[PDB]
Design a protein around this motif. Sequence first.
Motif, mmCIF file in Angstrom:
data_model
loop_
_atom_site.group_PDB
_atom_site.id
_atom_site.type_symbol
_atom_site.label_atom_id
_atom_site.label_comp_id
_atom_site.label_asym_id
_atom_site.label_seq_id
_atom_site.Cartn_x
_atom_site.Cartn_y
_atom_site.Cartn_z
ATOM 1 N N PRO A 1 -6.489 12.524 -1.627
ATOM 2 C CA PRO A 1 -5.725 13.198 -0.567
ATOM 3 C C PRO A 1 -4.852 14.320 -1.091
ATOM 4 O O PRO A 1 -4.669 15.330 -0.401
ATOM 5 C CB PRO A 1 -4.895 12.060 0.040
ATOM 6 N N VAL A 2 -4.306 14.180 -2.293
ATOM 7 C CA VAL A 2 -3.456 15.220 -2.856
ATOM 8 C C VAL A 2 -4.321 16.284 -3.524
ATOM 9 O O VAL A 2 -5.253 15.979 -4.278
ATOM 10 C CB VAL A 2 -2.406 14.611 -3.809
ATOM 11 N N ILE A 3 -4.056 17.542 -3.182
ATOM 12 C CA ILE A 3 -4.734 18.699 -3.757
ATOM 13 C C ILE A 3 -3.679 19.561 -4.431
ATOM 14 O O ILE A 3 -2.691 19.947 -3.790
ATOM 15 C CB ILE A 3 -5.497 19.509 -2.696
ATOM 16 N N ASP A 4 -3.892 19.848 -5.722
ATOM 17 C CA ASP A 4 -3.045 20.723 -6.544
ATOM 18 C C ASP A 4 -1.604 20.199 -6.604
ATOM 19 O O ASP A 4 -0.634 20.926 -6.376
ATOM 20 C CB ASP A 4 -3.117 22.178 -6.053
ATOM 21 N N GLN A 5 -1.489 18.892 -6.859
ATOM 22 C CA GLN A 5 -0.248 18.193 -7.212
ATOM 23 C C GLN A 5 0.831 18.278 -6.134
ATOM 24 O O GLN A 5 2.022 18.148 -6.434
ATOM 25 C CB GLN A 5 0.306 18.691 -8.553
ATOM 26 N N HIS A 6 0.442 18.492 -4.882
ATOM 27 C CA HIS A 6 1.375 18.455 -3.769
ATOM 28 C C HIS A 6 0.637 17.929 -2.550
ATOM 29 O O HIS A 6 -0.511 18.307 -2.296
ATOM 30 C CB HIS A 6 1.992 19.832 -3.488
ATOM 31 N N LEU A 7 1.293 17.041 -1.812
ATOM 32 C CA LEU A 7 0.635 16.308 -0.746
ATOM 33 C C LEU A 7 0.444 17.186 0.484
ATOM 34 O O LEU A 7 1.250 18.074 0.769
ATOM 35 C CB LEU A 7 1.450 15.067 -0.380
ATOM 36 N N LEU A 8 -0.651 16.938 1.198
ATOM 37 C CA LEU A 8 -0.838 17.521 2.517
ATOM 38 C C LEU A 8 0.211 16.972 3.475
ATOM 39 O O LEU A 8 0.667 15.836 3.333
ATOM 40 C CB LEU A 8 -2.233 17.209 3.047
ATOM 41 N N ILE A 9 0.580 17.792 4.467
ATOM 42 C CA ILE A 9 1.652 17.444 5.400
ATOM 43 C C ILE A 9 1.259 16.247 6.267
ATOM 44 O O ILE A 9 2.124 15.474 6.706
ATOM 45 C CB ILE A 9 2.027 18.690 6.235
ATOM 46 N N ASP A 10 -0.044 16.041 6.460
ATOM 47 C CA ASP A 10 -0.561 14.888 7.186
ATOM 48 C C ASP A 10 -0.225 13.586 6.464
ATOM 49 O O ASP A 10 0.475 12.715 7.001
ATOM 50 C CB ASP A 10 -2.070 15.061 7.331
ATOM 51 N N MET A 11 -0.695 13.451 5.224
ATOM 52 C CA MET A 11 -0.383 12.265 4.439
ATOM 53 C C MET A 11 1.081 12.210 4.030
ATOM 54 O O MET A 11 1.592 11.114 3.775
ATOM 55 C CB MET A 11 -1.275 12.204 3.201
ATOM 56 N N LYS A 12 1.766 13.358 3.984
ATOM 57 C CA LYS A 12 3.208 13.358 3.756
ATOM 58 C C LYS A 12 3.938 12.666 4.895
ATOM 59 O O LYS A 12 4.821 11.835 4.662
ATOM 60 C CB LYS A 12 3.720 14.787 3.587
ATOM 61 N N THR A 13 3.564 12.982 6.140
ATOM 62 C CA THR A 13 4.120 12.275 7.290
ATOM 63 C C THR A 13 3.723 10.804 7.291
ATOM 64 O O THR A 13 4.552 9.941 7.616
ATOM 65 C CB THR A 13 3.658 12.933 8.587
ATOM 66 N N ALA A 14 2.478 10.512 6.897
ATOM 67 C CA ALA A 14 1.988 9.135 6.892
ATOM 68 C C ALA A 14 2.746 8.266 5.894
ATOM 69 O O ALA A 14 3.056 7.103 6.182
ATOM 70 C CB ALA A 14 0.493 9.117 6.585
ATOM 71 N N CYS A 15 3.064 8.811 4.720
ATOM 72 C CA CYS A 15 3.820 8.050 3.733
ATOM 73 C C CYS A 15 5.313 8.048 4.037
ATOM 74 O O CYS A 15 6.003 7.062 3.741
ATOM 75 C CB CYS A 15 3.563 8.612 2.337
ATOM 76 N N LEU A 16 5.821 9.134 4.629
ATOM 77 C CA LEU A 16 7.237 9.229 4.949
ATOM 78 C C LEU A 16 7.620 8.243 6.040
ATOM 79 O O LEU A 16 8.726 7.692 6.016
ATOM 80 C CB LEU A 16 7.570 10.658 5.370
#
Lengths: 49, 290, 282, 59
Positions: free
Chosen positions: C178-193
Amino acid sequence: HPGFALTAVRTDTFEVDMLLYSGKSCTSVIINNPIVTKEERDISTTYHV
Amino acid sequence: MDARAVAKRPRDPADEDNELVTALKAKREVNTISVRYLYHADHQALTARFFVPEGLVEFEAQPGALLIRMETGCDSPRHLYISLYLLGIRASNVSASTRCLLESVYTASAARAALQWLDLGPHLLHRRLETLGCVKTVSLGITSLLTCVMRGYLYNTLKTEVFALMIPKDMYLTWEETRGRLQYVYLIIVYDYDGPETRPGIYVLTSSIAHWQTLVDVARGKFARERCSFVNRRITRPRQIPLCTGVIQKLGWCLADDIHTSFLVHKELKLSVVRLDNFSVELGDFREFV
Amino acid sequence: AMEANIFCTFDHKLSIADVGKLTKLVAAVVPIPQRLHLIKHYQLGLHQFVDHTRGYVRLRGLLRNMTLTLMRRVEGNQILLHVPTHGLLYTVLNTGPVTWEKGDALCVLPPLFHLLTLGQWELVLPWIVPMPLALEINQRLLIMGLFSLDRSYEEVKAAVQQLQTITFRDATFTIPDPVIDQHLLIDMKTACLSMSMVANLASELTMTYVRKLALEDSSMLLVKCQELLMRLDRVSPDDEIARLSALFVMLRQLDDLIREQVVFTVCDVSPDNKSATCIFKG
Amino acid sequence: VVRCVRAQVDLGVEVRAARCPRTGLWIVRDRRGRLRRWLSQPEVCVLYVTPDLDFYWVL
């Protein structure tokens, strides 16, 4: 040579043809008319006769 | 398009001729197969064939029993088909006399093999089992053949015998004396979180409640000893992670005026059972409750 | 006696080999944004949904509310989609990457690993997958999104290497990261947050509320609960209102991952394992 | 069974014990599952012996 002998068994299949002899009108076969039953799927329905 | 086609009466789907009849009569041949009324055409019992070994076909010649499948982690059988009566050994709710009885009937290799398979992994039963429905027929060779019913009623072909689902008396569970007019029936599996005795409690609940929130709310208040046992094993053994203190799923619904008693006979070993005559199968997945 | 068949026209010249390609996909599932009658191919599948900066979870949230039609027939310049109803039974192709058996419960998933193609169009069809592998994929992807910030260390690369592959019956299959270039997508960022927020509020407010409730404790259950919380643990009320509403809105922003409704249950698969018969379920 | 206040030492009685599976402790009962209730009372004490030479003095 050890102290014991060995008896060894082994089965062997043989492709063979029987011949069956019977008398005139030995058994009675009773049939009916074959019936179709239906099983419904979407893309391929089946009929069991 | 025009007004006559929408003003015509709907075509009788049974009284119109069959596809074989309209194929024959347009070309006018004859065959030895009698055709003109196909069997199973007016059917809604969605069947599914199933192959079983001989060890799991006992108590199944009499029709109507839960054909609940399982999976083993070993790759050669990917699934197996346990009967509900064969699940009674792992049922903690089954009394010792009834358990000693029904262990004296499943003494083939497949039943005890499934019993060893049930209590081996790091999982519970609700992620181990999977419900299918009721069996109505049996071919009964050595490798038998079962035809379950996923959705619909339980009837013989040509509709002349409404088959009935039996459940053993140690798994029957009703909750009010004033039974409703229409009632549903669910499959409760609870867990007592004792260490050695982690064998679950099997229950077939028959209630008038059709909602899910008001069913689990009155289900928390009837297994509070096992709920407190879950919290007790949570606190005395921490850093172990259990889950799904109880699981329910919708099995079907009956008419509540014909749920009666009977007894199964299998090699003259009777067993008192709760019998559900006009059963229907409408499955639901394994939901859980804490 | 024709049934509900959505007429799906095309907008492009096709060869005979194109129709011969497309006629192999008869008994497959197709997501449709609205239960319409006449539709093009630009609203046919998932390639209209695929965003560059949005990922798997935002595709799945736009996958819970789609009419999962089939393809009954294909002919000259049109397709005949077939809307299924709950109760009947239909043939579904084994277009998923993982095989099935007899008796499983099947649901939908976005295609993680990679059909018709045009200049701007690529026909893409969703994965159909049994339920335990679906739950395994959810719990893999959420944890792999949770290892996003601490990716720099040398052990956690082997840990996400272990987490990257799954195992079914003879399916040693792996997923994209899910992570591309060592920073999370905002989708999975919301999902983990959302998960981190509900955990951090549960570890903060539940103690106060259970000690408020302990005077009206009328069961032998809540006292063991507050004893458990006490053993773990070793202002103006509008803040409490805001915190409880924040708790419930971060719960409401999470229900795309907490469950999956059963859609198909197989009844019998085809031999050589390319199609099956499934009763549709809501 | 010794009754300390009323001074009536009850000499010999049968009792039937089990492991109460909610915890790891014992529960004593009579021949009809009566759940012998002296242990709530502070006026009495009891001595338990088992057929494996075990000794349980209970206050």
